[PDB]
Write a protein that binds this ligand. Structure first.
Ligand SMILES: C[C@H](NC(=O)c1cccc(CNC2=NCCN2)c1)c1cccc(Cl)c1
Length: 299
């Protein structure tokens, strides 16, 4: 069992936090918020670094390029923005969605960005030109998550429509459809499994190749929000998620037992992230709290 303990509380957002993500090189945590801002914090000392601004409405997600130099953000202003982290400058505004942009990610090469929107579509964008390469008529309700697999050859998407779909990146064709709203999905680090959250207080681990559910994780509260969940791999092999009872939940991936619940937040824990090399979790909460917490474990 891990022993995550609170190390830092990061204050500065003035509305709900939406998404926190560690840079791939481990140096930084980026946060996005309903306050229209991205903030950058030191991953190991929690020290506030800078605010990145330019969206006209709140931000629901942020993601890093593989070299840790760029961010992309998804906003209620119906755009994504690509940012140079060092300069804080908006390099490109990605225009095309017809409703809020809710989720985003770079591919491993980081030449592409995938987005999902309240407009029910998934879009694939060229980072260099800032132009949309493909629009996938992916779902029949808002798209809650989008994620590339380990080499970027596949995209997984999820939606309030109750479906999780897997797409061939190069062609845009749907390869597989895996019905409560699906509120989050993500490939496992090796690309073989998909972790999927549904709004009936349940997470499930699916075998992509077999299209079969292998594990179910329960005990947390998730009936309303699209809460980020994670595979923790730096120490023990855990599943980590936020929860609507204001706690971070950690489960043993294989046995499905809850191994720790992290207390301290005073609103829904909407986002968790796991550090790429250290046993460090970042968590963030909605507008009664507005803070990010950094936790550390010895395993
Ligand atoms: C009402 C609810 N809204 C949210 O869950 C919400 C609001 C602000 C910030 C975030 C975290 N952003 C995020 N989670 C995954 C990718 N980006 C989530 C909702 C429910 C079902 C489907 C949808 Cl689309 C929306």
């Amino acid at each position: 069992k891990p022993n995550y303990a609170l190390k830092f509380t990061l204050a500065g957002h003035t509305k709900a936090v939406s998404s926190v993500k560690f840079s791939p090189n481990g140096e930084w945590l980026a946060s996005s918020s309903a306050d229209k801002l991205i903030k950058i914090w030191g991953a190991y000392d929690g020290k506030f670094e800078k605010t990145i601004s330019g969206h006209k409405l709140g931000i629901s997600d942020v993601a890093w390029s593989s070299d840790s130099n760029l961010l992309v953000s998804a906003s209620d202003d119906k755009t994504l923005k690509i940012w140079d982290v060092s300069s804080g400058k908006c390099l490109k505004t990605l225009k095309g969605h017809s409703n809020y942009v809710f989720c985003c990610n770079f591919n491993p090469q980081s030449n592409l960005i995938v987005s999902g929107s309240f407009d029910e579509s998934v879009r694939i964008w060229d980072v260099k030109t800032g132009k949309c390469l493909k629009t996938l008529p992916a779902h029949s309700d808002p798209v809650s998550a989008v994620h590339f697999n380990r080499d970027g050859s596949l995209i997984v998407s999820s939606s309030y429509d109750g479906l999780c779909r897997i797409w061939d990146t190069a062609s845009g064709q749907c390869l597989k459809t895996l019905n409560p709203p699906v509120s989050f999905v993500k490939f496992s680090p090796n690309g073989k499994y998909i972790l999927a959250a549904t709004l009936d207080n349940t997470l499930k681990l699916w075998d992509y190749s077999k299209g079969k559910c292998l594990k179910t994780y329960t005990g947390h509260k998730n009936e309303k929000y699209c809460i980020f969940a994670n595979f923790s791999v730096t120490g023990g092999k855990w599943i980590v998620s936020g929860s609507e009872d204001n706690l971070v939940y950690i489960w043993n991936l294989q046995t499905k037992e809850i191994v720790q619940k992290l207390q301290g937040h005073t609103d829904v824990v909407i986002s968790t992230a796991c550090h790429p090399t250290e046993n460090i979790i970042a968590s963030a909460a909605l507008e009664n709290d507005k803070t990010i917490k950094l936790w550390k474990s010895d395993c």
